[PDB]
Design a protein around this ligand. Structure first.
Ligand SMILES: O=c1ccn([C@@H]2O[C@H](COP(=O)(O)OP(=O)(O)O)[C@@H](O)[C@H]2O)c(=O)[nH]1
Ligand SMILES: O=c1ccn([C@@H]2O[C@H](COP(=O)(O)OP(=O)(O)O)[C@@H](O)[C@H]2O)c(=O)[nH]1
Ligand SMILES: O=c1ccn([C@@H]2O[C@H](COP(=O)(O)OP(=O)(O)O)[C@@H](O)[C@H]2O)c(=O)[nH]1
Ligand SMILES: O=P(O)(O)OC[C@@H]1O[C@@H](O)[C@H](O)[C@H](O)[C@H]1O
Ligand SMILES: O=P(O)(O)OC[C@@H]1O[C@@H](O)[C@H](O)[C@H](O)[C@H]1O
Ligand SMILES: O=P(O)(O)OC[C@@H]1O[C@@H](O)[C@H](O)[C@H](O)[C@H]1O
Ligand SMILES: OC[C@H]1O[C@H](O)[C@H](O)[C@@H](O)[C@@H]1O
Ligand SMILES: OC[C@H]1O[C@H](O)[C@H](O)[C@@H](O)[C@@H]1O
Ligand SMILES: OC[C@H]1O[C@H](O)[C@H](O)[C@@H](O)[C@@H]1O
Lengths: 590, 295, 590
């Protein structure tokens, strides 16, 4: 098996997660005949990969057959023990002969990549290197086994045509997880779901680009022995646009972390929410005028797509929910996070300063705490109950007064934790300042935009993504166009209720698998049969309905949402890959 | 008190010089010049010239000693800069990561001691904690040099201190034997960074250099000597004049009286450099004895 | 060099400390030609010794020359890096032929050991083994060097006669640190210092025993090329009783631990006194009616000799000082420790229970402390100064009341921390209950008898001896008969003022080395020209005078006492051993 892809060592939301979750089961069920191919980027990928430059059995012949011939191929383990013997390929090591590879592409399939975008050039170069490695392996192994080559996305789709030109006896499977042409039309301010058969692919390809990419994608789909897509909705645009109906639907699964107790995810949520509460206390210093027990943490994560990931409708719903909470005289407050990576330069002074003063207050309270504890210990040793007024003197009251005065703040807490280099052109900040949300005292919702992926080694918010998601209360992902949707998937795996859409692969998958959804925390939101304003109103209604329920109802809802983890497990969802491999073997050679 | 305050200053230095802790901290001496922001009156130009010269001698002498010189002179700022707060944040993030590995190691060691078997030291730490230590080490990697000013001043092109610092080529580099930290604000016990009031910080330093040209009496050296810290006064100062005829043979009690009346500016700078180097050469025992004599 | 002795691996107050302190300088000045010989006891001595059974250079010939011949010889390092290549000898391994060794002793010097005491039989067996090892080494080394053999005490004195019988060409030095006959006459309720020339050695030897021991000691003194003693007072009884005037006086030194700062011993004293204060709070639970800042810690340590170490006079002085402190209306209190090992079975329930309730109160105060700190942190985060009455609720007051009630105690704290198996015959407890000292509320002095050596791994008092001594305030050692005195020596080395005697080697040594003593914390107490009652009165006066001075005076006195460490340093006191070695070399062979 060869699961060649571009995201194996570099962290990107797509491809990387599905491969990392699949590797364990796909290796334990099959064995050491599982091989993974990907690129090399000088970004720290070697930190997570245990490279094996020295010769190693289980395809030891290529190391002394081709490595010392002007190429660069490594063998790694990934630090994940699913037996993922990964074949890492360097991109910049072999780039001096791009002209001959372009000529080879011209001879074979009249395709290639223009010099405008280096991403696709690197993808094609990696495809050439992968094809050379696979051919060398077949030559060295005397063609005794019939290996199956599987391809993900267009970043590794040139392998299909390269192998078909050379007629290598392998079973070809191609699985596209996102028709990028659909992605770039859905961002073109044009309706995409009302009609699909009225699109002219060649006319649209090129004004927004995606002409060579579309051509190579369709060539791979046609020439691949087995074609596959993520959701049933994915197959719909695949057969209507690429004119190649997928052989079988292959829903995306996850490696659920089973605990010895059913309620351990609740404890993880409690701890992570405590950490988020510490961050909130840091950010809203001098403005802690709202109860923190009535605070709910909403969030929308993923790549920074405004109209595709559904951030405009979420912000409109947040403004409306703020208006209803203000006019209803409610003590509930909602802190909404926005984890969408936009380029910054560093943090702003306000956020780091807020964390600093929060922990300075923590230190001052600690000091008074040890002094009080020592005096109380003396009193208990003597045998007299404290009268509570003889312990604290004038100096510690003086320093508490000084600390309180130092934390006084007149400006409002910032909406962005980082210092972005383009604030006049950022959609999120623009609409935030348009809808009049500035974390004010009167505001019932507080927006925090964290334009960066979460990491466990960050100066502020020392939580990785999974822990932070476990800490939140509701994940709102009203995405207009996205094939499957991972973020709601692990939200429901970790027990957090989520707001999906009927235009999403996750929402569609959970639509017909459960009778009466939204009773299990899956607030499916209709975006196909409703206008934008109606969808915003429905999102506001869903948010308010989540707000009105008490703590017991929230706990019960989280339990019900967690109970659905078995649907997205790779044990249940891995059978489709096995079926695809069986069809590929039957088509190529029994 | 000096030991505790120097420990706090060491924590601040570790925060500021994160990813650049290539110098021994036991060979680090903390000089400072405090008071109101007068350049030619409080003697900040001559101090910076002497700092540059002492850096040159320490570099050409192959010395392991390093000197961190503080400049507490209030100039109007707007807030801190991102680099300094970020440095404190990553320092205490490393502290938290080391703490986490520390509790895990302590629990495993407690289990081993309860069983009755001496640790073999390789069965305790697994792959995950090594992974997070590697990630923490990578996160603290830094390519830019530590800043010379902890705050964000609104006029850097017209500040005398920063101008002469960038003129004398001092940027807290790895090769630099002296590191300059300009803190344009009075110290306070309730500050987000450096949570020390002025007296505690002065107790933590090693030598207070106040080569003031014109000032009537001089308080800063007075409480420096009251708290035991050796000081460098001048014969144009009221404190220096007062201590001149009250003690036979000064500079044997930590009062490095510096002549600025009968000497030119260059000669005064050379004498200040000689005094700084002489303070640098003496060992820990000599420093302790000198602090006792000054107290 | 061969510093053969019985206390090299087993912990005994004498011999062990002097050898362990000397080894560093005597090895750094000379080198790897330094060899140490001692016995083997199955008591954990191998834990502190890195045995080298495998062959090792620097006398590698004996390992393959004699070890595989029915004997048992090891090579060790001691874990002390003074280069102490120690030659460890097993005692029980070679004991099957004691009859032939007894016959050899009869042939050589008409000496030996009767079967009443196994200590001296083991000593003689170890002496035979040492002589065999030394002879084998000379045979293997072709007698190229002229090694010097030095002997300590009568536990290794048979080596002198054994080597003299065989006429081995070595330079013999013998250093007796205690004339044991003097020790056992001074405990016989007979005056010993008024006259020395009127004693009949043979008549006294045997009724109290020490006949064979005395004979072999005097034979070693006569036959040794160089004879040496600890103090000038030691030489006095040596020449008047053994009839062999020592060649030179060899005062006992110590390896002083120099710190980078002069005042570090003050900080060590502060920390150790804090630990002793924790122990006192544990022991006196429910009876902490006295200020702990006015508490002074006196102690008398060493082996359990009542009339020789001066414990009766110390207890009489403690009772008198208690009477004066009571009638003077003083707030000062004195806790007097008695570290004298007597056999026990385990601790008593009261002391362990007291430590337990002390740390239970510590835990309860801690719990209230975290609750208070969290509430205070919330208040400071809000921005409001605490009003100090809204934080503590009824439950934590309830548990503080319950804890206070649980620590109520009606019986007085015990005087002995352990459970001794003979309380009706213990001199210390007998005189304590006679002088009416029971740690009462009215008592101004509190006596704690700890019948065991201090250790760092004890369930209570987790302090080794040096740390505890650093923590105390005054070491009272009014010893009647003891040759030199180590305990006051390291008391003054570590800065603690001490009360020595003019009958002591340390007191005599410090008498003529400093003008006007007792101005440096050395309270020399006259016991030769004064009666017992007068000595007790002088001790009471010294204790009261120490009590009256304030904290500043105590600190200054500790500084002055610490300044005298250079007198007892081995650098200054090691020249006498060098002189003795030079005389031995001159007498044996130039
Ligand atoms: O701060 C973040 C936010 C998102 N993700 C990852 O990004 C993926 C989102 O994938 P999705 O299919 O939702 O959309 P994509 O970002 O791939 O377009 C999830 O698997 C997350 O694990 C992350 O690692 N850190
Ligand atoms: O960070 C600082 C620096 C200086 N000072 C005070 O400023 C005074 C300096 O007075 P001096 O006579 O040296 O000169 P002045 O500043 O009055 O001109 C000293 O007493 C210090 O206590 C302070 O409080 N904090
Ligand atoms: O709790 C104790 C008490 C005493 N000692 C040691 O016992 C020795 C006392 O020797 P000294 O010459 O005072 O009298 P000895 O006990 O040898 O007769 C000192 O060196 C101490 O180090 C000890 O290790 N722990
Ligand atoms: O954050 P909430 O919705 O109020 O949930 C409250 C918390 O949920 C879970 O983490 C646990 O059951 C906690 O015990 C509970 O306090
Ligand atoms: O900072 P230094 O000059 O090296 O002084 C070293 C320190 O001085 C004092 O604070 C104390 O004596 C400390 O015990 C000592 O370690
Ligand atoms: O126990 P005392 O005799 O009262 O001595 C008091 C203590 O002595 C030394 O340990 C130190 O100087 C301490 O700073 C001091 O508090
Ligand atoms: O369909 C699988 C997932 O990965 C894809 O590459 C897309 O980035 C994401 O939107 C999709 O949900
Ligand atoms: O002379 C007394 C002190 O206070 C004065 O006001 C000056 O500011 C200062 O330089 C002087 O040393
Ligand atoms: O004289 C040296 C020291 O060790 C001796 O063996 C005695 O036990 C002790 O009292 C003496 O002070």
């Amino acid at each position: 098996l060869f699961e060649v892809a571009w995201e194996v060592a570099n962290k990107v939301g797509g491809i990387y997660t599905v491969l990392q979750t699949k590797a364990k089961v796909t290796g334990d069920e099959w064995g050491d005949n599982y091989f993974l191919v990907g690129p090399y980027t000088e970004q720290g990928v070697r930190t997570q990969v245990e490279l094996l430059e020295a010769p190693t059995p289980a395809l030891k012949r290529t190391l002394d057959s081709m490595n010392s011939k002007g190429c660069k191929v490594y063998f790694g383990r990934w630090l994940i023990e699913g037996g993922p013997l990964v074949v890492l390929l360097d991109v910049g090591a072999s780039a001096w002969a791009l002209e001959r590879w372009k000529g080879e592409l011209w001879d074979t399939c009249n395709i290639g990549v223009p010099w405008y975008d280096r991403e696709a050039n690197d993808a094609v170069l990696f495809g050439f290197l992968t094809t050379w490695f696979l051919g060398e392996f077949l030559a060295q192994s005397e063609e005794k086994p019939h290996v199956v080559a599987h391809f993900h996305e267009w970043l590794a789709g040139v392998g299909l045509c390269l192998c078909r030109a050379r007629r290598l006896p392998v079973a070809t499977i191609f699985t596209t997880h996102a028709t990028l042409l659909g992605r770039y039309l859905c961002a073109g301010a044009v309706d995409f779901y009302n009609n699909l058969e009225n699109f002219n692919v060649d006319k649209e390809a090129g004004e927004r680009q995606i002409y060579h990419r579309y051509c190579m994608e369709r060539a791979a789909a046609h020439c691949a022995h087995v074609f596959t897509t993520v959701s049933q909705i994915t197959a719909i645009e695949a057969q209507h646009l690429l004119k190649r109906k997928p052989d079988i639907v292959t829903p995306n699964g996850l490696n659920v972390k089973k605990f010895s107790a059913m309620h351990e995810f609740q404890n993880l949520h409690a701890q992570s929410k405590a950490r988020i509460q510490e961050f909130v206390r840091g950010h809203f210093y001098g403005h802690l005028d709202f109860n923190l027990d009535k605070t709910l943490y909403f969030f929308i994560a993923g790549r920074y797509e405004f109209s595709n990931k559904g951030a405009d409708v979420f912000l409109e719903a947040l403004a409306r929910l703020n208006y209803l909470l203000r006019v209803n005289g409610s003590e509930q407050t909602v802190v909404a996070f926005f984890i969408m990576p936009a380029r910054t330069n560093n943090f702003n002074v306000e956020t780091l300063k807020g964390q600093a003063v929060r922990k300075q207050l923590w230190d001052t309270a600690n000091t008074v705490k040890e002094k009080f504890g020592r005096k109380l210990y003396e009193s208990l040793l003597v045998g007299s109950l404290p009268d509570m007024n003889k312990m604290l003197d004038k100096e510690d009251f003086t320093m508490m007064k000084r600390a309180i005065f130092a934390t006084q703040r007149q400006s409002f807490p910032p909406v962005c934790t980082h210092n972005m280099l383009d604030d006049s052109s950022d959609p999120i900040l623009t609409t935030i300042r348009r809808i009049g949300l500035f974390n004010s005292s009167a505001d019932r919702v507080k927006v925090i935009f964290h334009p960066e992926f979460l990491s466990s080694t960050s100066p502020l918010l020392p939580v990785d993504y999974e822990e932070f998601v476990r800490g939140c209360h509701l994940g709102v992902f009203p995405s207009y166009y996205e094939p499957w949707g991972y973020t709601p998937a692990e939200c429901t795996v970790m027990g957090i209720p989520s707001i999906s859409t009927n235009l999403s692969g996750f929402g569609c998958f959970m639509e017909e698998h459960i009778a009466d959804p939204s009773a299990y925390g899956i607030y499916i939101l209709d975006r196909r049969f409703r206008s934008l304003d109606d969808s915003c109103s429905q999102l506001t209604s869903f948010l308010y309905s989540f707000c009105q329920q008490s703590r017991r109802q929230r706990i019960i809802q989280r339990n019900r949402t967690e109970r659905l983890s078995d649907l997205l497990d790779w044990k249940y969802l891995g059978r489709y890959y096995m079926s695809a491999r069986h069809m590929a073997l039957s088509k190529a050679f029994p």
